[PDB]
Nucleic acid binder design. Structure first.
Ligand SMILES: [Mg+2]
Ligand SMILES: [Mg+2]
Ligand SMILES: [Mg+2]
Ligand SMILES: [Mg+2]
Ligand SMILES: [Mg+2]
Ligand SMILES: [Mg+2]
Ligand SMILES: [Mg+2]
Ligand SMILES: [Mg+2]
Ligand SMILES: [Mg+2]
Ligand SMILES: [Mg+2]
Ligand SMILES: [Mg+2]
Ligand SMILES: [Mg+2]
Ligand SMILES: [Mg+2]
Ligand SMILES: [Mg+2]
Ligand SMILES: [Mg+2]
Ligand SMILES: [Mg+2]
Ligand SMILES: [Mg+2]
Ligand SMILES: [Mg+2]
Ligand SMILES: [Mg+2]
Ligand SMILES: [Mg+2]
Ligand SMILES: [Mg+2]
Ligand SMILES: [Mg+2]
Ligand SMILES: [Mg+2]
Ligand SMILES: [Mg+2]
Ligand SMILES: [Mg+2]
Ligand SMILES: [Mg+2]
Ligand SMILES: [Mg+2]
Ligand SMILES: [Mg+2]
Ligand SMILES: [Mg+2]
Ligand SMILES: [Mg+2]
Ligand SMILES: [Mg+2]
Ligand SMILES: [Mg+2]
Ligand SMILES: [Mg+2]
Ligand SMILES: [Mg+2]
Ligand SMILES: [Mg+2]
Ligand SMILES: [Mg+2]
Ligand SMILES: [Mg+2]
Lengths: 76, 94, 58, 117, 136
RNA sequence: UGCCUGGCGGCCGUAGCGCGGUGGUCCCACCUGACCCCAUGCCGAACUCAGAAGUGAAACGCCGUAGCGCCGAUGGUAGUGUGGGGUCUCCCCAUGCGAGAGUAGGGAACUGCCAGGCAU
RNA sequence: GCUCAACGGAUAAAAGGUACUCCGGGGAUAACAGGCUGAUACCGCCCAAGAGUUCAUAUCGACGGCGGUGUUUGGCACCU
RNA sequence: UCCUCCUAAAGAGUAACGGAGGAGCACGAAGGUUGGCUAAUCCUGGUCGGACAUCAGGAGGUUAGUGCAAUGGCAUAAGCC
RNA sequence: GGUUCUCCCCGAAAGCUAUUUAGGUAGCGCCUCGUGAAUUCAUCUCCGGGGGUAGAGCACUGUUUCGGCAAGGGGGUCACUUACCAACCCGAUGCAAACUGCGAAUACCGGAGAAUGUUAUCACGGGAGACACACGGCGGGUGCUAACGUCCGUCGUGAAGAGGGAAACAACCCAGACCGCCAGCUAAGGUCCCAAAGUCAUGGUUAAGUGGGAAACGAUGUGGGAAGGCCCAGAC
């Protein structure tokens, strides 16, 4: 029937990009599913938020037989 | 037996290639085998007329470049979207 | 580095923000103004962004 | 899924977790005739110590290489070999086999001989 | 008269019509009618032109239509103000870019195809030209 | 050191699929037996245990092979940042960036750790 | 313990009429006329299957195409 | 009021009485963990049995499934015991 | 509605969010003044990043046409068959804001470095104003790719900006006025007279006052270019 509706935008996306130095706990990407997967020193929260488990530099990689995207954290 | 006269291109890319066609010439390329591709420029009217005979697309042609003869076959052709004109040709070394 | 001279050749009025900011970085204050700068890739890069409104002498 | 591809699937989760944890794993492989044990470094690509029933010093003292007594012998031997190299804390990677019977005989003996897990 | 039998969505953004055509060669028949200009062909236009060329050959030979009007066009009627929801779908067009082969034909002599395509072209809102099959 | 096999990784299709050939001393596999440990929303299929009569049939591994997948230029084409222009629904010029598809072509993976069998 | 859903929730508690009307304001905003537009209207043309015994275009013309006017039905809300 | 997608111009955000839908609940297991498992669809064969029930094989390979809209995820499953 | 002397410095907004709110108001954004603080910020260069847009493509989700193959359905049997329709599949061809087995330019985040920039940056504190925007360019939704229409994004200008040009003409082009000059150079735009500057030079085109309004379409107007058919076995 009638249209006219939408919902508030959820501000998903990458918060820290490659190379960026972050403190442990910092959110690196908000996403709805695991577009990105947690790599070394990176954790996955219940809404698939990836966050730093250690102080260091953000590092995006592509790994494994499925060519999946992973975010890890390098000590700096 | 078709004989095509060509010079090697001094430039490359979109700008250079459009300037060729505004000058009644058009780019082409020769590849195949051991030698490196050879970017060239052709006279439009001369090759337009030639390629209006099925033989062009099935015979061994000879391109003459700096008084050297290269034996080729026509391989692909890009035509203008709607005019009786040629935009580009691939030749493969025969 | 080696020194080049840069002159502003058109008005800054009506230009893109990034271009104004690039003129500021060159230190050009007005049409006709000539400025002595070092010949670095960083400086050449600013000249290049606003090349349509500056003249270089080397 | 055939027996093997099925087992590898059964093994993937635990191995990723151990990989994540950076653990030194004691990896077991079982066969109808033989059983094998490897202590592999966290990089996943270096074997620090190993024992199995295909090596003659071990199979020689064994009735049948493919049973529980043999499994106890292999486990005990990796443990010893491992302790002599300073290796003590590891994690068990049952590699998709049930923690049971032979695998468990191997595990129990490895612990018995001072290997910590 | 051509129309999609069903669609995912009823209505469509206006959008734009930039670019050159894909499908610029005579790929089925012997001769083709090609767009030289840019624009919209309605289903009624496509039909009017198909009829004309088909009279012209006395339903001999064979005819192909390379375009399909899959874009729904809406309109607001008289005495309605702006807004209050998007208009109602009234008809369907195909978006045409320079170079699109519109119709193909074979099984007739070239002279007759040119005539038939001449009659058809007089029904269309975009300039066209007559084209032939080409080796490669 | 060389061939062969098993395990664990790197790499993530130039690495896969198919088709043909090929291997069992060893390893692997099927296999034998099953009261029992243990198991089947039924089933010893699977999981599991005790084994060694048979076979490499299947699977697996190796070698071959361009039907397919995959990779893939050069050149042109499309788009586009900045500046300028036209007949401004769209385009053109200068400059910089420059695809996608297709073409030639590549391609029957590469590689580390440990262990076992064989040979010189 | 509130569908305080008018969902940052004026009160625990509330519908209407005014052509008998009134004040403060707005061309911030409607009705007339102007203006912009020209889908619609009106006028003209392009193609020509067909009507016209025969014959497309004397007189007309299907399916479609392109325009001109400002001129109807409207759109807008720029002036008052 | 709230959620999902597009408009939205490849970071976030972004309007209209723009284009499409959904929520105002459910669940003590439909939560936790250990252990295990793997769809759809099609072809062939098979009592009653039919285009379609349950059985077997083969192709297929997640097109299934996810309490519910949409989108993003999901095989190490997040799906199923 | 009106709000009264002078000079100087800086200099907005017409947006977000909430509002019995919508021409009101509040917080934030943007202005000013003061205090303090970092190599704080900007441009460029190199370095480290994620993209799913333009474009393309058609494996996916849909849509689409031609050909092959085909289960199935509609019709005739009194199980078999018909010039019918036929999904899937194979080959070929297009279309997509809510398609993606591809994918830019730009833009954005981060590191480092020089030059430049009257700190341009951030923090706290005193004072606000503003929350009717307009046109133009680009990318779009809506509308008819109608509107001096309407709604977002982004830049420019007007607003709050004089001067030169576009006859006149906020919003377009050039350009930013501290004051004085009866000096000089330029910008856009111009140089026969009104009217400052070429009745300039050189090679062409046009004959329509085209230039100095308007499409499909029509035509031995005329200029340039590359080919072809017939022809002294006599062509037109
Ligand atoms: Mg260019
Ligand atoms: Mg068995
Ligand atoms: Mg075999
Ligand atoms: Mg080859
Ligand atoms: Mg390149
Ligand atoms: Mg690329
Ligand atoms: Mg490419
Ligand atoms: Mg490819
Ligand atoms: Mg060895
Ligand atoms: Mg409210
Ligand atoms: Mg009365
Ligand atoms: Mg009364
Ligand atoms: Mg009054
Ligand atoms: Mg008004
Ligand atoms: Mg009026
Ligand atoms: Mg208005
Ligand atoms: Mg008036
Ligand atoms: Mg975005
Ligand atoms: Mg963006
Ligand atoms: Mg669940
Ligand atoms: Mg599990
Ligand atoms: Mg059946
Ligand atoms: Mg000032
Ligand atoms: Mg209230
Ligand atoms: Mg970079
Ligand atoms: Mg596109
Ligand atoms: Mg078909
Ligand atoms: Mg402040
Ligand atoms: Mg307000
Ligand atoms: Mg407002
Ligand atoms: Mg606005
Ligand atoms: Mg307006
Ligand atoms: Mg004002
Ligand atoms: Mg004037
Ligand atoms: Mg000034
Ligand atoms: Mg004068
Ligand atoms: Mg005139």
């Amino acid at each position: 029937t009638r249209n006219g509706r939408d919902s508030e935008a959820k501000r998903l996306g990458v918060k820290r990009f490659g190379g960026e130095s972050v403190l442990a706990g910092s959110i690196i990407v908000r996403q709805r599913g695991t577009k990105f997967h947690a790599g070394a020193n990176v954790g996955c929260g219940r809404d698939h938020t990836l966050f730093a488990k250690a102080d260091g530099k953000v590092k995006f990689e592509v790994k494994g037989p499925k060519n999946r995207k992973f975010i890890s954290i390098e000590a700096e | 037996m078709f004989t095509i006269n060509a010079e090697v291109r001094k430039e490359q890319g979109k700008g250079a290639s459009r300037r060729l066609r505004a000058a009644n010439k058009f780019p082409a390329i020769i590849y195949g085998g051991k030698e490196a591709p050879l970017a060239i420029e052709l006279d439009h009217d001369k090759v337009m007329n030639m390629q209006a005979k099925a033989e062009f697309y099935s015979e061994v042609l000879t391109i003459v470049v700096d008084g050297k003869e290269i034996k080729v076959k026509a391989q692909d052709v890009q035509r203008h979207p709607y005019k009786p004109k040629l935009q580009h040709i691939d030749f493969v070394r025969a | 580095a080696k020194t080049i001279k840069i002159t502003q050749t058109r008005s800054a009025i009506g230009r893109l923000p990034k271009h104004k900011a690039t003129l500021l970085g060159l230190g050009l204050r007005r049409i006709g103004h000539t400025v002595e700068r070092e010949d670095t890739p960083a400086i050449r890069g600013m000249i290049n962004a606003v090349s349509f409104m500056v003249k270089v002498e080397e | 899924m055939d027996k093997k591809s099925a087992r590898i699937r059964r093994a993937t989760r635990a191995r990723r977790k151990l990989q994540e944890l950076g653990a030194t794993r004691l990896v077991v492989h079982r066969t109808p005739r033989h059983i094998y044990a490897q202590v592999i470094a966290p990089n996943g690509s270096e074997v620090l110590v190993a024992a199995s029933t295909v090596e003659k010093a071990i199979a020689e003292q064994l009735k049948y290489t493919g049973n529980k007594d043999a499994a106890a012998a292999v486990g005990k031997a990796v443990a010893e070999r491992a302790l002599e190299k300073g290796i003590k804390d590891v994690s068990f990677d049952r590699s998709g086999f049930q923690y049971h019977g032979r695998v468990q005989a191997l595990a129990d003996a490895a612990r018995e001989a001072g290997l910590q897990f | 008269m051509l129309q999609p039998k069903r669609t995912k969505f009823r209505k469509m953004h206006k959008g734009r019509n930039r670019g050159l055509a894909q499908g610029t060669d005579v790929s089925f028949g012997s001769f083709g009618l090609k767009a030289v200009g840019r624009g919209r062909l309605t289903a009624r236009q496509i039909e009017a032109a198909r009829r004309a060329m088909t009279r012209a050959v006395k339903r001999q030979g064979k005819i192909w239509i390379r375009v399909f009007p899959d874009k729904p066009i809406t309109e607001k009627p008289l005495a309605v103000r702006m807004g209050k929801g998007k208009g109602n779908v009234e008809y369907w067009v195909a978006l045409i870019q320079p170079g699109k082969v519109l119709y193909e034909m074979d099984g007739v002599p070239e002279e007759l195809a040119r005539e038939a395509f001449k009659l058809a072209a007089a029904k269309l809102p975009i300039k066209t030209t007559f084209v032939t099959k080409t080796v490669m």
